[PDB]
Amino acid sequence: NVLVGKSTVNGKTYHLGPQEIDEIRKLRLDNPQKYTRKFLAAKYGISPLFVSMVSKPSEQHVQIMESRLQEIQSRWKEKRRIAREDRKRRKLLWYQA
């Protein structure tokens, strides 16, 4: 197998209920730093994709991490910026087929 998902290796599970899904949401909105996607996935035996599906982080959290991305991009040099645009175009060309 190549880049296979864990659920695909061992099939999907449907075992969480409304109350613990709601409390997952409360934890995520409370302390996104302490209760990360991987932490919640480990705690509740689900996938980080499912955590993102059911929960939603805080606006402050997303704003600060977008700013972090902006800083990392700004610290780049000319060559890395061009290389990243090239990666984007190449990846887009993957799907045209």
Add this chain to the structure above:
RNA sequence: GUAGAAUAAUAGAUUUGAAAUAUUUAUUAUAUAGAUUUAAAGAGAUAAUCAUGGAGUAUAAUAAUUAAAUUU
């Protein structure tokens, strides 16, 4: 147009499927192994912008008289 029906966005609302081939889907650093790429101090070719040079071209008094052709 003294006015309405008539495309897409931009967002909004109300619904909507999923545990979503996410131990890499999007993008983000380090380390190891390996494979590579990227010059313009100047130059060639071509074109253009400035020159240089004076080939080529026109004219050889351009006044006036005579003659043929014209607006009123």
